[PDB]
Amino acid sequence: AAIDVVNRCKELKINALHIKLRAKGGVETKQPGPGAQSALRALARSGMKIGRIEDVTPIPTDSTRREGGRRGRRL
Amino acid sequence: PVKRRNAGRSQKNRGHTRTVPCTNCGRQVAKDKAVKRYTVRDMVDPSSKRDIQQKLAFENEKQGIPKLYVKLQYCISCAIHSRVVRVRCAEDRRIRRP
RNA sequence: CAGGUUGUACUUCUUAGAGGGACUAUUGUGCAAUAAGCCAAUGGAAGUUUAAGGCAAUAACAGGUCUGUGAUGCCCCUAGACGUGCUCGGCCGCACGCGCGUUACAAUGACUGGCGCAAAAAGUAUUUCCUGUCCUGGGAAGGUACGGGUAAUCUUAUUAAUACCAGUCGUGUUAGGGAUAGUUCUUUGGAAUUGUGGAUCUUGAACGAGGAAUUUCUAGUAAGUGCAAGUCAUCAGCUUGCGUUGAUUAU
RNA sequence: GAUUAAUAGGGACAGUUGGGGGCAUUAGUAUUUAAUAGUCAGAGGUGAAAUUCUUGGAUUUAUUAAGGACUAACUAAUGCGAAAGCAUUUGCCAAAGAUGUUUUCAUUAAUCAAGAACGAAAGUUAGGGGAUCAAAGACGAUCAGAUACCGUCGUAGUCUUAACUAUAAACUAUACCGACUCGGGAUCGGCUGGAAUAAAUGUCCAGUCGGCACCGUAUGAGAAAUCAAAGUCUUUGGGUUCUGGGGGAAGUAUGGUACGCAAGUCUGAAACUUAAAGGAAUUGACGGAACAGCACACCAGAAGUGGAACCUGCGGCUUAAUUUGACUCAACAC
Ligand SMILES: [Mg+2]
Ligand SMILES: [Mg+2]
Ligand SMILES: [Mg+2]
Ligand SMILES: [Mg+2]
Ligand SMILES: [Mg+2]
Ligand SMILES: [Mg+2]
Ligand SMILES: [Mg+2]
Ligand SMILES: [Mg+2]
Ligand SMILES: [Mg+2]
Ligand SMILES: [Mg+2]
Ligand SMILES: [Mg+2]
Ligand SMILES: [Mg+2]
Ligand SMILES: [Mg+2]
Ligand SMILES: [Mg+2]
Ligand SMILES: [Mg+2]
Ligand SMILES: [Mg+2]
Ligand SMILES: [Mg+2]
Ligand SMILES: [Mg+2]
Ligand SMILES: [Mg+2]
Ligand SMILES: [Mg+2]
Ligand SMILES: [Mg+2]
Ligand SMILES: [Mg+2]
Ligand SMILES: [Mg+2]
Ligand SMILES: [Mg+2]
Ligand SMILES: [Mg+2]
Ligand SMILES: [Mg+2]
Ligand SMILES: [Mg+2]
Ligand SMILES: [Mg+2]
Ligand SMILES: [Mg+2]
Ligand SMILES: [Mg+2]
Ligand SMILES: [Zn+2]
């Protein structure tokens, strides 16, 4: 999915990319998935220039009753 | 009989402490009790950064990739099982910051 | 090139007795606190504590054996006895269910012929044990013709089989395979019939590499291949050993 | 002619401290959901998938809006509150501790049946509100079985006003007031001396009251775990309240019947039945628990039983009789 984009990008005539990295912040594991460090890595290797890099996983101030409840995923 | 003095938690004055959801099971755990370890995570693995540095672009203030900030909160129940804190022996149970 | 001798001749081969020889040695990384030690290389018959075994601690399994015991407690039987002996049966009986194994499905083979390669075991009171030479039988096996040994002296320094060269067969459950069965002949034993073993000519089944599972096994080891020894009058498909041919993969 | 003024207690006062409380106000992301644009075939969810959602555009990216709850990171054996409980800003309203006192008052006090004030959740009545999560329910999956532990949705609730309900491992499972006794630093609040900078609602050094808490230790306590109090109790007596008297039946009843709209609370038996039920530790064994090893245990592979016919052992069934032992490795060519 990464290398597929770079090809499409050389055609848009774009070489540099700004990265806004997230991961369903909301009320979910505010930790990046696995296909994260993998995607970036692919863009850099397949050429691509990399602009600034941000982390935009939406951290909330409050919260709302998460996945599961009281005890959550059990087993 | 009694196993701990703090029973795992630090509630020392007040009668009640806010409850918080577990980073892993989602379970509700009292703040004070639950395990914590807010860590400074790195975006890419070791040898993998160098690959992104050469194909990097923007200026180079020598500030590299922003490091990921993970505020970790585990409830005992899964905290253990998750290799975090292993059942410690008798007198080592009072040791803090080994 | 075989054979016979002979020498107070020699020991390499063989025998076996003394004594050597490795201890992890020498060299550099890992360990490293100093270490104990671990690794690799070199030298080495020999470096996994050299290889393979023997011996095998404290507890215990109410494991197994009173059918090995003139080791026994208790309880049983006692002369038409569970004593002892004799004759004849049986433990191998067959619809089947398990467990060691033996042989094989074949051309990296089978069959015919040729070929001095081995090891370890055994062996008698007269003929009674191992049996060499010789004679007779198609053959198993006979005879007693000539002989050695109660053994590094005699069966023997050889009688293995796999292997190797030649030839026939040529994918064909063909005969690879040999179960089942039928006369004959021969050896052990008073007796073999509910085939002792062995020879002959036939008969010629399943088997075409085997499901779910599952056992051992790292080197002269697996495997294959024969030879012994126990049992034994006669009977091995078992056991305990022996050598030949000899590898994949790990460490 | 009226004792001191209790390291007793009540008031006055002074700066100050606190996520204490009640009204206001005020944000902030996020979750939903909506608009405005933007594409493009997959999203989402699990170990795997599946119902679910989607080119009458999903998931996705940017802006913005509506809405209900929530207060992150700082937030820790730190703070306040009688307890339950309490963390966005700012502004009011009455309150509180501690410290500071050469201020008054001078026993006013300790604890308490009656008798009252509170008391997360869940739950109840009548209205609001309804974003997220979600009992019951509807579905997928998982299983031999799953109306269960996962997954997709969803009603009550969860939020609020006004009533009612009072229980909870309402826990330090350790009643309040008081006096003593070991060591030690670090804390939070107040005060007093001092030093450097600097002249700071800061920092440090040293005191010290009062408040969580920890460390070390006891010829003090205990059944021990452990306890600085769970200590100053056979050397058995500072003051006061509540509670227990083997276990199960049971905190349950056609019980009581004081509360309650209703769940139920409060009080609370007996019959029956029993050597034990319990507490704390010691060793061992086991763990669908941590850590560390070792073995053809598995890894890499070989050979091969298992299938075939024979052989031989065991079972079974026969039989006059088929001698009997042995049965997971630790029986069966023994
Ligand atoms: Mg509480
Ligand atoms: Mg040895
Ligand atoms: Mg022994
Ligand atoms: Mg005996
Ligand atoms: Mg008789
Ligand atoms: Mg003869
Ligand atoms: Mg011989
Ligand atoms: Mg032929
Ligand atoms: Mg016959
Ligand atoms: Mg025969
Ligand atoms: Mg053999
Ligand atoms: Mg013989
Ligand atoms: Mg024999
Ligand atoms: Mg306030
Ligand atoms: Mg979802
Ligand atoms: Mg908003
Ligand atoms: Mg504070
Ligand atoms: Mg905040
Ligand atoms: Mg009330
Ligand atoms: Mg309502
Ligand atoms: Mg099924
Ligand atoms: Mg939901
Ligand atoms: Mg001062
Ligand atoms: Mg001080
Ligand atoms: Mg006591
Ligand atoms: Mg202490
Ligand atoms: Mg007393
Ligand atoms: Mg009642
Ligand atoms: Mg116990
Ligand atoms: Mg039998
Ligand atoms: Zn958890």
Å: B68 CA to C54 C1': 68
Sign of CA dihedral B77, B83, B84, B88: positive
- Is B70 an interface residue toward A (CB < 8 Å)? yes
- Cα–Cα distance, A23 to A36 (Å, whole number): 9
Distance CA A6, CA B57 (A): 15
Query: Taking Cα atoms as reference points, which of B14, B18, B66 lies closest to residue A54?
Result: B66
End-to-end distance of chain A based on CA atoms, in angstroms? 33
| Chain A touched by B81 (CB under 8 Å) | no
- Residue A37 makes CB contacts below 8 A (sequence gap 6+) with B43, B44, B45, B48
Q: Chain B residues with CB inside 8 Å of A67's CB?
A: 26
Q: Which residue has the tokens 């774009």?
A: A14
CB atoms inside a 10 Å sphere around CB B70: 15
Per the CB < 8 Å rule, is B26 touching A55? no
Cα A26 from Cα A31, distance rounded (Å): 11
Distance CA B28, CA B68 (A): 25
Name the 3-class secondary structure at A39: helix
Residue A59 φ/ψ, nearest 5 degrees: -80, 130
What Å resolution does this PDB entry report? 3.9
What percentage of chain A's residues is helix, strand, coil (to nearest 5)? 30, 20, 50
Residue spans of alpha helices (H) in chain A: 2-12, 35-45
